[PDB]
């Protein structure tokens, strides 16, 4: 703490696992179509596009402090319910969705 | 897709009569060949059902769904099993005064193996 937060470790687990699943979902979408896809895969897809286009993407002269990064992370993960978030302690999950 | 809008019947006389009244089948006005086949139970040879089977599935193409009685379908078991196409659909329903049997149902056998 004091250059990180406590909630840093749990989040690192949620975002990596969800992201991986997001890549797998993109391939499945191309095959099944948009009007025949799963709910769980649909969520994973939405996450892939936002994750890429907000978390990873930053501007040339835009500084991303670690505290700043962690907030953007909660917006992305929010789309999943609490039921699908679980590599996060319920303590954290209740603080920040 | 759409190129077929008759439902053909292989069934006992009463069941068929009823179905026609309700309006599903017809006797065509330019072929003059029935698009249904009535059956007198036990009084009609197994060979005549088979000609009629070929007729709805292959020699006709305006047949959407092929309805067939479990009692009758069993007699000509070989021909039904060998038919595996979806054009027309094969849907076996119980015969009159006969109960369900999974083994007079060609499709159910097929599905069970190789699941």
């Amino acid at each position: 703490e004091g250059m990180t937060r406590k909630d840093h470790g749990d989040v690192s687990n949620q975002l990596y696992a969800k992201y991986a699943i997001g890549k797998d979902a993109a391939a499945m979408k191309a095959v099944v179509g948009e009007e025949a896809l799963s709910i769980e895969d649909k969520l994973s897809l939405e996450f892939l596009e936002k994750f890429e286009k907000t978390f990873i993407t930053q501007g040339a002269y835009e500084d991303r402090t670690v505290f700043e990064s962690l907030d953007q992370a909660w917006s992305l993960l929010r789309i999943y319910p609490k039921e699908m978030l679980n590599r996060i302690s319920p303590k954290i999950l209740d603080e920040f969705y | 897709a759409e190129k077929r809008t008759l439902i053909a019947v292989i069934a006992d006389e009463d069941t068929t009569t009823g179905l026609l009244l309700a309006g599903i089948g017809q006797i065509t006005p330019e072929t003059q060949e029935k698009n249904f086949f009535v059956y007198q139970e036990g009084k009609t040879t197994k060979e005549e059902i088979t000609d009629k089977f070929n007729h709805f599935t292959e020699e006709r193409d305006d047949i959407a769904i092929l309805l067939i009685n479990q009692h009758i379908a069993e007699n000509i078991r070989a021909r039904v099993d060998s038919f595996t196409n979806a054009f027309p659909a094969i849907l076996e329903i119980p015969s009159k005064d006969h109960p369900y049997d999974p083994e007079k149902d060609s499709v159910l056998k097929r599905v069970r193996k190789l699941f």
Binding site: - | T17, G18, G23, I65, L91, K96, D105, L108
Partner: protein, 210 residues
């Protein structure tokens, strides 16, 4: 036999093609069999349900045929020259594959047939058609899943063969070929250095003695 000098690059991409196919095709297979199971339980029930309805409508029609003292069915066969209940076909994407679905229409431009007015026997046929049109509608609406089912049954069998084929044959062929070429390849680079070192040793001897 396959090229020795830097096949590695193409052969690696072959592996990546293969790999992508196992995961994706397995997801696709997984999803089709998950659906297949759902249909299975529906179709099984629907067979029993159609049978009960068909036997009950058939018995009411039979009673009537016998009471009037003439066989209605002969009368009925002349008059049938159209069908009220027909189907209209649609292709529906259930996963990537197109299955046949049907949606039923009742022609309102189609009048009642004339098999009534027979006297007391005519009342009996008139009540009879009304139960039967209701009954017959059942058989067709339930039947729409069957055609989709049969197709689903054929396609899953093909998709199942493809996963097994890429997994067992294709991927290990890419491994073994890559390896064969690797082993020759590293040795061409190594032996050269040894050849150089052997010639240079002779050279150092001559030069040193001067």
């Amino acid at each position: 036999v396959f090229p020795t000098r830097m096949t590695l690059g193409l052969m690696k991409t072959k592996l990546k093609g293969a790999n992508q196919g196992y995961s994706l095709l397995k997801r696709k297979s997984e999803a089709l069999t998950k659906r297949f199971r759902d249909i299975t339980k529906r179709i099984d029930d629907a067979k029993q349900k159609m049978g009960r309805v068909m036997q009950t409508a058939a018995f009411s029609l039979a009673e009537v045929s016998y009471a009037t003292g003439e066989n209605i069915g002969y009368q009925v066969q002349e008059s049938v020259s159209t069908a009220r209940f027909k189907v209209r076909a649609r292709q529906e994407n259930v996963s990537g594959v197109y299955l046949s679905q049907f949606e039923s229409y009742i022609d309102p431009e189609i009048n009642d047939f004339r098999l009534t007015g027979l006297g007391r026997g005519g009342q009996q046929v008139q009540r009879a058609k009304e139960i039967y049109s209701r009954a017959v509608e059942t058989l067709v609406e339930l039947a729409s899943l069957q055609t989709a089912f049969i197709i689903l049954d054929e396609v899953i069998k093909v998709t199942n063969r493809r996963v097994n084929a890429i997994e067992h044959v294709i991927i290990p062929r890419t491994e073994n070929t890559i390896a064969y070429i690797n082993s020759e390849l590293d040795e061409l680079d190594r032996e050269e250095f040894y050849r150089l070192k052997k010639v240079q040793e002779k050279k150092q001897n001559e030069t040193a003695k001067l």
